[PDB]
Each structure stands twice: as structure tokens, then as C-alpha cells.
Enzyme design. Structure first.
Site, PDB file in Angstrom:
ATOM      1  N   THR A   1       0.849  -1.181   0.000  1.00 56.47           N
ATOM      2  CA  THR A   1       0.000   0.000   0.000  1.00 56.47           C
ATOM      3  C   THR A   1       0.888   1.235   0.000  1.00 56.47           C
ATOM      4  OG1 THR A   1      -1.762  -1.172   1.186  1.00 56.47           O
ATOM      5  CG2 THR A   1      -1.812   1.235   1.241  1.00 56.47           C
TER       6      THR A   1
ATOM      7  N   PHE B   1      -1.420   7.197  -2.457  1.00 56.50           N
ATOM      8  CA  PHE B   1      -2.864   7.369  -2.345  1.00 56.50           C
ATOM      9  C   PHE B   1      -3.550   6.183  -3.006  1.00 56.50           C
ATOM     10  CE2 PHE B   1      -1.242  11.643  -1.827  1.00 56.50           C
ATOM     11  CZ  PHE B   1      -2.004  12.125  -0.779  1.00 56.50           C
TER      12      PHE B   1
ATOM     13  N   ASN C   1      -2.092   1.852  -3.910  1.00 55.75           N
ATOM     14  CA  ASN C   1      -1.351   0.642  -3.601  1.00 55.75           C
ATOM     15  C   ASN C   1      -0.138   0.500  -4.506  1.00 55.75           C
ATOM     16  OD1 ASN C   1      -3.053  -0.385  -1.508  1.00 55.75           O
ATOM     17  ND2 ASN C   1      -4.530  -0.999  -3.086  1.00 55.75           N
ATOM     18  N   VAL C   2       0.973   0.089  -3.906  1.00 51.56           N
ATOM     19  CA  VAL C   2       2.142  -0.339  -4.665  1.00 51.56           C
ATOM     20  C   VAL C   2       1.813  -1.717  -5.232  1.00 51.56           C
ATOM     21  CG1 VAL C   2       4.581  -0.904  -4.561  1.00 51.56           C
ATOM     22  CG2 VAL C   2       3.695   1.019  -3.246  1.00 51.56           C
TER      23      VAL C   2
ATOM     24  N   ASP D   1      11.851   9.337   5.194  1.00 57.97           N
ATOM     25  CA  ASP D   1      10.878   8.258   5.341  1.00 57.97           C
ATOM     26  C   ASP D   1      11.583   6.926   5.566  1.00 57.97           C
ATOM     27  OD1 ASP D   1       8.712   9.996   4.973  1.00 57.97           O
ATOM     28  OD2 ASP D   1       8.681   9.698   2.803  1.00 57.97           O
TER      29      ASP D   1
END
Lengths: 563, 563
Positions: free
Chosen positions: A10, A13, A15-16, A96
Site C-alpha cells: 500500500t 494514495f 497501492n504499490v 521516510d
């Protein structure tokens, strides 16, 4: 034709996702942002993709709960170091940070690592809106100790809010933090015991982490090296990455010592280093390779044998259990809060895995000793083939020697008639006859092939059975691990200690037989040298005695020219 | 101290008992007659014991329901023959004939047999009170066919009363009797098909049993040989006991033929006997022993190979099932009266046991072929060791040949000065040089050890798995045998036929590789003979050329005496 398979996760905005080609193995992750974004967020995602065009499964393994292997941590330091410096050269702060950002990719045995949850968000990110690249140092070194111990460096097993409320209340000049059962916050400025890293690395990694885990933001990187525009932690990491550390598995005492070495160390200088440092004599420093090759000291896992000592006593286990684990060995039925139980059980599993690696590496050096035995065997075969060759050739030379001197004795006896013969030649040929007179060939051959068949008998493992025992134990740790009495685990400790003791003592008997074979070979060698030397010398004397007989015939030609 | 153990049976007026010594293995049977007898019966027992001082478990085995192995029946004929003639010499008629009278006693592999139920009581003993020794012939030959077929020669599966009522109503010139399902009494003057005995024995045993199973009492023994005071059946049994029957397991066709031979047969005469009889050429009659030794024809289980034919086709199974068994293969669910079912199942078990013996004996001769291969291998090793010995010795002889003729060339060149030299000697020494010039040594060596390693690769069974299959089948025959559908048994027939076919074809591939190895060896042999011959001849020429050079030196001594 791209196949819309299952997602890879996910992201953004959406999903991967995994979109493989329908025919080929052409996989790519596409960060789905189909959801209607504001133009600052949509265009934000646009330059995110534009700049992008310019491991967590391993973090949760059952086998490294107290932390990862040394060499793997090293490769993560160099790879993720090159990624982080690659991003800091590109004027980009990622911020991140998580193990999910790191790709696994086998290349011939090597995993390659590139960069793509409140425990990684910085305390100044907990407080302030602007930030620097120091959050990469805090979160990165945080994740590094999450590779070193398998869990969080500050107050692990707590919720991240009160956790950072104690981070900002922690002395930042310390390294490790924990909390006791009585509510005490106890934190350490040194690394804990459950570690596999060598101390030579540990203490510069300790002070390195004292700069890394310094939660004061202005001091996360370093006193900056003004000559290379470089923070201190980068200098220390490149310092650590170029350390030349070898390992000598001290077999006879069941030990191993790492050796931090200068880059210009000849192997003879290292022989002196071991002879003074370990106290093991260079006349008995038996150093075998991972393939069992003895070294050349003219060059710059090493296996250590004592060439003198054939007696092999029991192993010297310098790794005990911790007294929590030994307390559970003494009393297994105590139902504690199960966090400390999985801690203790985890320590037990890492212990028995250490035992597995002990049988693994000692087993390995035993095999290398057998390979060196094969090399000595091929040497013996060469020497005996050359030996019996020159021996039998020498015998034929003696044969035509005796027939030749028999014929010469005939001609001498016939030319005796006119008084031509000179008796000094005759007595000389008698001396040549006794030299022609001048078994253990085939007898020491029987020593050779006797030892050969004996080695082949010694050629005719149980740590796979102990791998089933330990495998049962780690299965117990998994089945008790997924849950939100320890007696049988201590029984597996019993079977592994005693079974390990049995097979180690048997293999020590094997090794004693091996060194007996080796000393028997090295005893056989100057026999071959002296014997072969007598063969070649005696050969050249008999050949020169034939040439001397031709000089006597030559002298008879002088007698023929005399008349 | 005799231990009063369990009984050995019930005998006399009490029990036959086992009284072992308490310490040693000293067992004896004591016929208990403690019960109060009349003095004719008590004294009767007294002279019974006094004259005595002067197998039924094998009769009920699961594995010989259609009768016993040939050689075991032979040993019972000679042993029980010696016992019966031993009793008839002692003027004693036993008359109490049963398999319980016969002792089992292993002596190094050999069971020894001595003598200690209305089916054995004679029909004249069914009728009259006095008797002769003919009842021993009737009951004994009766029990003999109870070894041959496993059951009664006359109307088996009936009660003995109506049984003897049909014995005295049987044509006594016939041998075997049976009864069909429709109530027909059908009896045969020949032996049935379920037999393992060779026909060469069977038909004199047929007519022998025509005298033995003749229930007419006056003709049970024979037309008595008046020269040796001997009944005809004794003469026929001693005739059969001295038959010299060999067996040649015809391997290439999966056969075996027994050969009744005269006692003065040389093995070469037998080679002619096989070449004319079997049609297999003596240039290809490969005859291997049970240890795999090829014979010496100068002397008087044999394994038969074709030396020419390397192609090995499939086995030629000349043993079918009977059409009852094949009927049950076609239709297994028919619940007949279970006597005929155990007959059919028994025929199946004896068939699959025959298959077991087929793989057993072919497997055996395969192993013998490998042993002969080892003997040829040792021959090759001897020839190559002698070969490289004389080769390298010959090389050293060439070495001192060339140095010797180099020195002789020097002395000749110096004595050339005064015109002494004769050029015919020189050109002769040049001819000797070209002869000194006059690889496949080591190349054919590589053929040798190449084939050696290839054989050792061929060295690296499934009839034990088929022994589990057949063992399952005989377990089915036992569990259905103790009772007062056959599909799975036919499935075991399927797995045994097909599995047997697979492993036989693989072993035939092995045998083809074996004969390929053997023909490769026999090709290698005259290479060694011719090569070794050239070595020895060339050796003796060069040695004689050195002696001829010494005759030239001798001639120079004649030149020295000439002046």
C-alpha cells in the site's frame, strides 16, 4: 500486455502493485495515485516521480532475534552507506526511513540494497516542522541497532509516544536503553552482551553510535572533517569498512580470535604475531586454509593446529548461558510474563545455534585436514613412482654393469696371456664389483599404501540430527512466539550438549588419527629423500665407473699406439 | 540334576518328555510308561526299550505345499533309505511309519535323519493281523509322495476309511489319484505337473513308485535281485543316488538343463556334448563356476554365456500359470469351495517363488560374471606392471647404449688418426643407432585403468522388494490357509512380473556392459603379448649388440696382438 497481478503493498494514495509482463519476468512497482489529489499534492507526486526517475522480512526472521550476523551488518553498512551518501550528494533528504524501503536482490550470493510507523520519526520531527539530514542519522542508526540487537535501541516494547518522552529525557551520551520489571529505567552507554560482532569493531561502533544515537539534533552526524567536507560518522564508517580482519579458528582449544591487521602484513610476520600473541610456536603453527592449503609466507577462516601435540582433549566452551537461562534450566515451570520468557528462550536458541556453528566450523576444519592429507598423499604417490622408476632403472644398470665387467673380465683374462694385463685395473674392477653390490624400497612402499588404505578406512553429520533438535527448539520458539513450561527446551539443551560432546570427542579421535597419519607421512619423506639421493648418487658413480672403464679401454688404445 | 521341563509329545502310556540337565544342554526324550501295565505289555515295553538301546513340522511348511525341493528329497531318500535298510538288516519291521518318527539335526548345513493317524496303516493291516516288511514300502513310498506333492498319493482330502475302500478298488499299476468336483475318481499312472524334480529322475521314480505304490502286498518291494538278495526298489534307489547330474543355467535364454552324465566325462567331451546338444559353439561356450571360474577341460550350478553375442534380449519364461490360476487372473471374485482356491493360490505362490529363484540365480551368475571380471582385472594389472617394468628398464638400456656408443664413437674418432679405424664398424654402429631408435605403453595403460574405473563405476537387490511382494502373497496364503476374493494376489502377480521385467532388463544391460568389458580385455591381451614380445626381443638384440661391440673391441685386441 502487462498483467495486473496482486499488489506489492500500500503506497501513496493507493497501492504499490506488481505489474508483470504476461510472458516475461518483467516486474515493476507502480505507486498508484489514481485518487483525486489537490494540485499541490498531485504536482507534488509528479516531481516525486520525476526525482525518482533521476528488508523488513529479514528484520523479523526467527533466527536472528538478538540481532544479525557480523558480515551481513557490514554489507548493510557499506550498501546503505553508499545509498545515504548517494542521496546526500543529490541534495535530497529522504526522511521516510523504514526497513520496507530496502530491496532484496541476490546477485551470485550477494544481496544488493537500494532505498525506495512512528518509531523512526525524529523527536524534532515529533516537535518541529522544518528538519535537516540529521533525522536520517537518528533513524538510520536506530535501524542499525535494530539490526544489531533485532529491536529498538531506546525503550523498546513501549508505545512510541511515551517512548520519545523518555528519549528526550535520556542522557544522549549513552547507547542502549532497557526497562526492568520493577519499573526502573536503566540505560547503558555500551553495547549489550547478545552480540556476534568482534569487539575491535564494537567499541568504535559504540562511540560511533554515541554520535549516531545522540538525540541532540546538532550533534547527530559529527565534528565535520573540514578537509573532505565530511561528518565524523562517515569517516568512522569508511574507517571500519577498510579494516582488514582475519579469523583464526583455534581448533585445539575450540576457540577463534579475530585479528585486526595492518595492510602490509607478511604471513611470516603474522606467524611471529601468533607466536608471541597466542604463544603457539611457529615450528608447530599448522595453518590450513578453508580448502586446507598451508600458506606461503612470501605472500601477505584460518585453521590452527599444534604440530607437536597429538593428544586432543575436550572442547573448551567459553560460552555459558546467561543466568536467566540457567535459572530456567534450574526452574522451568515458572510462568513469567511471556516477553521475558521469549527473551530467555531466544537466548537459548542463539546459544544452541552457536553450538551448531561450533560443530559446523570444527567439522569444516576437520574436512580441510583431510584435504591436506590428500595433498600429502599425492606427494607420496609422485615420490614413490619416481622412486621405483629410478630404482628399477638402476637395477638394469647394475645388470649390464655385471655382464659388461664379466665380458671385460673375459677379455682381460685372454690378454693376460702376453703379460699385457695390469692388476690394478683388475682390483679396481673388483672394487667396482663391491660397489655394484652397493627391499626397503617395497617395504616403505608397503608403509605408503598401508597408510593409504588406512586413510581410506578413516574416510568411512550428526549435527544434522542436532539440527533436528535445535530445529525442534526454534519451532517451539515460533509456536510460542506467535502467541500474545520450558522443560523440554532444557531437555533439548541436554541432548545437544551431550550428543555434541559425543560426536566432538569422536571427531577429536579422528583428528588424532589424522595427525598420526601426517606425522607418519613427514617421517616417510626424508626416507624418500635420502633413498632417492643414494639412488641418484650411486647411479652416477656406476655410470662414471663405466666411463672410467672406457678410459681404461682408451688407455689400452694408448697401449696399442705405444707399439 | 535333570530338569523336568515341558513334554516333547505324547507317547506310549504317557508322554514323551524333555528332561534337560539344569546346567548343560543335555536333552533326551524319555517315553513315560508309568501307567500300570499288564506284564505282557509292561515286559513288551521292556524289550521295546532294550531293542531301542541296540520332520512333521517340515511336512506342513507354507513354502512347499506342492512338494519339496529335489535335493532335499534326495537326501531324505539316502538317509531314510539307510535307516530302513538298517532296520531290515536288524530283522526288525517298524510298521509305525509317520513324519513324527524322524529327527531334525543340523550338522554344518546338513540335516541328519533317524527313525524313532490312519493314513499310514496298510490295507492288509486294515484287513489282516500278521504282516511283513511290505507295509514299510507302502507307507514309506506313501510318505515319499507326501514329500513330492506335499499330500497323499491316493485319494487325498477324504477320510481314511472310504479312502482305503477306494485304494483296494484302485488299479495298482497307477501312481497318482485325485477326485474331481463332479464326483469322478480320476487317477494317473504318472506324476502330476507341480514338481521340481528333473524328468531324468522322475520317470525311474515313476516306475519306482509303480512298484512302491502297488497296494498288492506281494509286489511292494520288487522282483528280488538274487545276486545281492535285494528288492528292485533298493536297486533303483541306489541307482538314482549315484546318478551324476550337473546343471547348466542357460543364462542368455533364461533356461537351465540338467545333464545326466557318465562318470568318465571329461569337460572337453562335455563341451562337445553341449555344442552338439544345445547347439552352442565351443568357441563361444563361456562356462563359469558358482565362483565364476572358467574350467580346465583336463579335469572331469554352471553358468552359460555366449562369447559372441553381446546383444541380450528379454528373458524367455517357459513357465506359464496353470489355466485355473489364469482363470482366476481373468476372474478373481468367484467364491469356489476354498480347497480348490488354496490349490490355485498355492500354485500362484509356487510360481512367484519360481520367479524369486529366477532373479536369485540370474543375479547369482551376474555376480559370478563380475568375479571373473575381477580375475581378468588382476591379470591385466600383473601384465601392465611387468610391462612398464621391462619398458623402463629397456629405456635405461637404451640410455647407456647411446652413451656407450657415444664414447665408442669418441675412441673410434681418435684412433681414426693412424688409419686404424674400419668404416664397416662405424656404419654398423649407425645401424645400431637406428635400432636404438627402434607411448602406447601409457596409452594402453590408460585403456586399462580407464576400463578399471569404468568397472568400479559399474559396481554402483530389488528381489528383496519382490520378496516383500511375494512375502505379502504367502502371508495371504497363510491367513487364508488357517481358515476352515483373489484380486490383490493377481495384482502382486502384476507387480512381480513387471518389476521383475524391469530389473531383469536393467541387469541385462549390466551384463552387456560386462561382456563389453570382457571383450575389451581380451582385445587388450595380445597387445600386451606382442608389445612385451617386442620389448624382450629388442632388449636381447641390443644386449647382443653390446656384446658384438665387445667382440669388436676383442677384434681390436686381435689388432693389438697383430703388431
Amino acid at each position: 500486455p502487462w498483467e495486473m497481478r496482486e499488489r506489492l503493498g500500500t503506497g501513496g494514495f493507493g497501492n504499490v502493485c506488481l505489474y508483470q509482463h504476461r510472458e516475461l519476468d518483467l516486474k515493476i512497482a507502480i505507486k498508484s495515485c489514481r485518487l483525486e489529489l489537490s494540485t499541490k499534492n498531485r504536482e507534488r507526486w509528479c516531481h516525486e516521480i520525476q526525482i525518482m526517475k533521476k528488508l523488513r522480512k529479514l528484520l523479523n526472521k526467527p533466527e536472528n532475534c538478538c540481532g544479525l550476523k557480523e558480515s551481513q551488518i557490514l554489507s548493510l553498512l557499506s550498501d546503505i552507506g553508499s545509498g545515504i551518501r548517494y542521496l546526500h550528494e543529490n541534495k535530497i533528504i529522504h526522511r521516510d526511513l523504514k526497513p520496507e524501503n530496502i530491496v532484496l536482490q541476490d546477485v551470485g550470493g550477494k544481496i544488493i540494497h537500494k532505498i525506495i510507523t512512528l518509531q523512526y520519526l525524529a523527536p524534532e520531527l515529533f516537535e518541529n516542522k522544518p528538519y535537516t539530514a540529521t533525522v536520517d542519522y537518528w533513524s538510520f542508526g536506530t535501524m542499525v541497532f535494530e539490526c544489531i540487537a533485532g529491536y529498538r535501541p531506546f525503550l523498546h516494547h513501549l508505545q512510541p509516544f511515551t517512548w520519545h518522552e523518555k528519549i528526550k529525557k535520556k542522557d544522549p551520551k549513552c547507547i542502549f536503553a532497557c526497562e526492568e520489571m520493577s519499573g526502573e529505567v536503566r540505560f547503558s552507554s555500551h553495547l549489550p552482551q547478545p552480540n556476534s560482532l568482534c569487539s575491535l569493531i564494537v567499541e568504535p561502533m559504540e562511540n560511533w553510535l554515541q554520535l549516531m544515537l545522540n538525540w541532540d539534533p546538532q550533534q547527530r552526524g559529527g565534528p565535520v572533517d573540514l578537509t573532505l567536507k565530511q561528518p565524523r560518522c562517515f569517516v568512522l564508517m569508511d574507517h571500519i569498512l577498510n579494516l582488514k580482519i582475519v579469523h583464526i579458528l583455534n581448533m585445539t582449544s575450540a576457540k577463534i580470535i579475530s585479528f585486526l591487521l595492518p595492510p602490509d602484513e607478511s604471513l611470516h610476520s603474522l606467524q611471529s604475531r601468533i607466536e608471541r600473541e597466542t604463544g603457539i610456536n611457529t615450528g608447530s603453527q599448522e595453518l590450513l586454509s578453508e580448502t586446507g592449503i598451508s600458506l606461503d609466507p612470501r605472500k601477505p577462516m584460518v585453521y590452527l593446529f599444534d604440530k607437536s601435540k597429538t593428544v586432543y582433549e575436550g572442547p573448551f566452551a567459553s560460552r555459558s548461558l546467561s543466568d536467566c537461562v540457567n535459572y530456567i534450566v534450574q526452574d522451568s515451570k515458572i510462568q513469567l510474563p511471556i516477553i521475558q520468557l521469549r527473551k530467555v528462550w531466544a537466548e537459548a536458541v542463539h546459544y544452541v545455534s552457536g553450538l551448531k556453528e561450533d560443530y559446523s566450523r570444527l567439522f569444516q576444519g576437520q574436512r580441510a585436514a583431510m584435504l591436506s592429507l590428500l595433498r600429502y598423499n599425492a606427494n607420496l604417490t609422485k615420490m614413490k613412482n619416481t622412486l621405483i622408476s629410478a630404482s628399477q632403472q638402476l637395477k638394469a644398470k647394475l645388470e649390464f654393469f655385471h655382464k659388461s665387467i664379466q665380458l671385460d673380465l673375459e677379455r682381460y683374462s685372454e690378454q693376460m696371456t702376453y703379460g699385457i694385463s695390469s692388476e690394478k685395473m683388475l682390483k679396481a674392477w673388483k672394487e667396482m664389483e663391491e660397489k655394484a653390490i652397493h627391499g626397503v624400497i617395497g617395504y616403505l612402499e608397503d608403509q605408503i599404501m598401508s597408510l593409504h588404505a588406512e586413510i581410506m578406512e578413516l574416510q568411512k553429520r550428526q549435527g544434522d540430527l542436532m539440527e533436528s533438535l535445535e530445529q525442534r527448539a526454534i519451532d517451539l520458539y515460533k509456536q510460542l512466539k506467535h502467541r500474545p513450561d520450558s522443560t523440554e527446551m532444557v531437555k533439548i539443551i541436554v541432548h545437544t550438549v551431550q550428543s555434541q560432546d559425543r560426536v566432538l570427542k569422536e571427531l577429536f579421535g579422528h583428528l588424532s588419527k589424522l595427525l598420526g597419519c601426517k606425522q607418519k607421512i613427514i617421517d616417510l619423506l626424508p626416507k624418500v629423500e635420502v633413498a632417492l639421493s643414494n639412488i641418484k648418487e650411486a647411479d652416477n658413480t656406476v655410470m662414471f665407473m663405466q666411463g672410467k672403464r672406457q678410459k681404461e679401454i682408451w688407455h689400452l688404445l694408448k697401449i696399442a699406439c705405444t707399439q
